[PDB]
Amino acid sequence: VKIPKSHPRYWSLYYREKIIEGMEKGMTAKAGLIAHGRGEAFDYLIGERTIEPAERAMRAAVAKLLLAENPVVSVNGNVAALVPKETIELARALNAKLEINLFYRTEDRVKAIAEELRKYDPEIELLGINPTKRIPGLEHERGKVDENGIWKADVVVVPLEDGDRTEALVRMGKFVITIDLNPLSRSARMADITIVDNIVRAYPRMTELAREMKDYSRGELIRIIEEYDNGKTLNDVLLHIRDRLTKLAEGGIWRKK
Amino acid sequence: PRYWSLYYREKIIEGMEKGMTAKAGLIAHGRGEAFDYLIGERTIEPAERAMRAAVAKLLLAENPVVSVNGNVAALVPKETIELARALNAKLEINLFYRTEDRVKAIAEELRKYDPEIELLGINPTKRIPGLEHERGKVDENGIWKADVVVVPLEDGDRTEALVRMGKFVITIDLNPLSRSARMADITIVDNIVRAYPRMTELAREMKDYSRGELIRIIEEYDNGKTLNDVLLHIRDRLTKLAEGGIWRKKQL
Ligand SMILES: Nc1ncnc2c1ncn2[C@@H]1O[C@H](COP(=O)(O)OP(=O)(O)OP(=O)(O)O)[C@@H](O)[C@H]1O
Ligand SMILES: Nc1ncnc2c1ncn2[C@@H]1O[C@H](COP(=O)(O)OP(=O)(O)OP(=O)(O)O)[C@@H](O)[C@H]1O
Numbered sequence: 001v002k003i004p005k006s007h008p009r010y011w012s013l014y015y016r017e018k019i020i021e022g023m024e025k026g027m028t029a030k031a032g033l034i035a036h037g038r039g040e041a042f043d044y045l046i047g048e049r050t051i052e053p054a055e056r057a058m059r060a061a062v063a064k065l066l067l068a069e070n071p072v073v074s075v076n077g078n079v080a081a082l083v084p085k086e087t088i089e090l091a092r093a094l095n096a097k098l099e100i101n102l103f104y105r106t107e108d109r110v111k112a113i114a115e116e117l118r119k120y121d122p123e124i125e126l127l128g129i130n131p132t133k134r135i136p137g138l139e140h141e142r143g144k145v146d147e148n149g150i151w152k153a154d155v156v157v158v159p160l161e162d163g164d165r166t167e168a169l170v171r172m173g174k175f176v177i178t179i180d181l182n183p184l185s186r187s188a189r190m191a192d193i194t195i196v197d198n199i200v201r202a203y204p205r206m207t208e209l210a211r212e213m214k215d216y217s218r219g220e221l222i223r224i225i226e227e228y229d230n231g232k233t234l235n236d237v238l239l240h241i242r243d244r245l246t247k248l249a250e251g252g253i254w255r256k257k
Numbered sequence: 258p259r260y261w262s263l264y265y266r267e268k269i270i271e272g273m274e275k276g277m278t279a280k281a282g283l284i285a286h287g288r289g290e291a292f293d294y295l296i297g298e299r300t301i302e303p304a305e306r307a308m309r310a311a312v313a314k315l316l317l318a319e320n321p322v323v324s325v326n327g328n329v330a331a332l333v334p335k336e337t338i339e340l341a342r343a344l345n346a347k348l349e350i351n352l353f354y355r356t357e358d359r360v361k362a363i364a365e366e367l368r369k370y371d372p373e374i375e376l377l378g379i380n381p382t383k384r385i386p387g388l389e390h391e392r393g394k395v396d397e398n399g400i401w402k403a404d405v406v407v408v409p410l411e412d413g414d415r416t417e418a419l420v421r422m423g424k425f426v427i428t429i430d431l432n433p434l435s436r437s438a439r440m441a442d443i444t445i446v447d448n449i450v451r452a453y454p455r456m457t458e459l460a461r462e463m464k465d466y467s468r469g470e471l472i473r474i475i476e477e478y479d480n481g482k483t484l485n486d487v488l489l490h491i492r493d494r495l496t497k498l499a500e501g502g503i504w505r506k507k508q509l
C-alpha cells in the first residue's frame with residue numbers, strides 16, 4: 001500500500017490498485033479499467049459520498065428487490081475486483097441470486113470471478129457459469145444469460161452495466177436497477193431505478209437498507225416504490241453535479257490552488 | 258453508433274497490447290471520457306479559442322516542442338506527427354512510466370506514419386528538477402531548450418515544474434479543473450482526437466497571418482476567462498439537460 005492513511009485521495013487510490021489487481025487476476029477486462037476511470041472522474045464530481053438522490057434510489061430499489069419474485073444481482077469483472085464480499089452480503093440479505101454476467105465472457109475470466117467470490121463464501125450458489133438462454137437483441141452471445149437467473153428474473157441489479165444490455169433487458173420486460181456513477185450513460189438513462197453512487201458505497205448501504213426494510217410490511221414497501229420517480233432523481237443528480245462544479249471553481253480556477 | 262467513443266476505446270486498449278500505453282493510461286482515458294460526457298463530446302468555442310491562441314504562440318516560437326506519451330501515441334500517432342511538421346516543431350517522447358520498451362514501442366508506432374521523423378526523448382540526458390528521475394527526463398535539444406512546449410494529457414506536477422523552468426506551457430486536457438489545466442499558460446479543453454487535427458488545420462492557415470496579427474491574438478488571450486467559459490458551458494448544459502429531463506431518452 002504505497003500511500004499514507006492521511007492521504008486526501010486515499011480511498012480513490014486504494015481502489016485504483018484493486019481494479020489493477022483485478023485485471024492481473026484475470027477478473028477485470030481492460031475495457032473495465034477505462035470504465036473505472038470514468039467512475040473516478042464522476043465520483044470526484046459528485047463528492048465521493050452517497051448523495052441524497054442516491055439514498056433515495058436505493059431505498060426504492062431495496063423495496064422493489066424485497067417484493068420481487070426472482071431477484072438477481074449481476075456480477076462482472078469490475079464488481080468482483082472491488083466489492084466481492086459486499087455483493088455476496090447484499091445477495092444474501094435480499095435472498096437474491098448471484099449471476100456472473102460479462103460482456104467479454106471467457107471461461108477463464110468466469111472462473112477467476114467464481115474463485116474470488118468463493119474466497120468469501122465457498123458455499124455460494126453461482127449462476128451464469130454455463131448460460132443457455134439469451135436476450136432478444138444484443139449480439140454474438142454478448143447477451144447470454146442463465147435460465148435460472150436473469151432469464152427467469154422480474155427484478156435485476158446490473159451494476160456498472162453496458163447500455164445495450166440494460167436497454168435490452170428493459171425491452172424483455174425486466175425491471176432494471178443499475179448502479180452507475182455516470183448519470184449521462186445510456187444505461188443510467190434507460191434503467192428503471194438508477195443509483196448514482198460508487199458501488200463500493202452503494203452495496204454496503206443497500207445491505208444495511210435490506211436489513212432494516214425486511215421488517216417493513218408490504219404496504220410500507222409499496223409506498224416507497226410508488227412514490228419513486230427515476231426521472232426527477234436523474235435530474236437532481238445533474239443539478240447536483242452542476243452545483244459542485246460552480247463550488248469547485250469559485251475563487252477562480254486558473255493559477256491555481 | 259456511439260462509434261467514435263468505442264473506436265478510441267479500442268485504440269487505447271490496443272495501445273497497451275502494443276506496450277505503448279500503461280495501465281494507468283487506460284484509467285486516465287476513462288477520466289477523459291467522463292469530462293467529454295459533460296462537455297458534450299465536441300469542440301466547444303473556448304477550446305477553439307484556446308487552440309487559435311496556442312497555434313499563434315507555436316508559430317512564433319523559437320524552439321517549439323510537442324510532447325508525446327503512451328496515450329497520445331495510442332490515439333493520434335498520425336496526427337501528432339502532422340501537427341509537429343505543420344508547426345515546424347520537434348517531437349519528444351516524454352512519459353511518466355518511462356521504460357525502454359515503451360519508448361521503443363512508441364517510436365516504432367510513430368515511425369509507421371513517418372519513418373524519417375526525428376524523435377527526441379529516446380535517450381534524454383537532462384532533467385527537470387523537483388520531480389523524480391523517471392518522471393523528469395527531458396531531451397537536451399527538445400524540452401530542455403524549448404521556449405514553448407505542448408504537453409497533452411499531462412500530470413500536473415510536470416506541467417507546474419516546466420512552468421517553474423520558465424517554459425511557456427500549452428496543454429490539452431478534458432478536465433478544466435485539473436492541476437495541469439490550472440497551471441498551464443494555455444489550456445485547451447478538448448478531446449485530443451479532436452484538438453490535434455484542428456490545430457494542424459489552424460497551423461496551415463494561420464501561417465498566412467502577419468506576425469503582428471499573431472502577436473495580437475497571443476496578447477488578447479486570457480486562459481482564466483477561457484476556463485470559466487468552459488465551466489459555464491458545462492453548467493448551462495447540465496441545467497438544460499435537467500430542465501428537459503433525460504430518463505428514457507435516446508439522444509441527449
Ligand atoms: N466504482 C464504480 N462505482 C459505480 N459505477 C462505476 C464505477 N466504475 C465505473 N462505473 C460506471 O460503470 C459503467 C460501465 O458501463 P460502460 O463501460 O458500458 O459505460 P458506457 O459504455 O460509457 O455507457 P453505455 O454503454 O450505457 O452507453 C460506466 O458508466 C461507469 O461510469
Ligand atoms: N482523449 C483525451 N482527450 C483530452 N484529455 C484527456 C483524454 N484522455 C484523458 N484526458 C485527460 O488527461 C488527464 C490524464 O492524466 P492523469 O489524470 O492520469 O494524470 P495525473 O493527474 O498526474 O494523475 P492523477 O489524476 O491520478 O493524479 C485527465 O485530466 C484526463 O481528463
Ligand SMILES: [Mg+2]
Binds near residue numbers: 413435436
Ligand atoms: Mg488528474
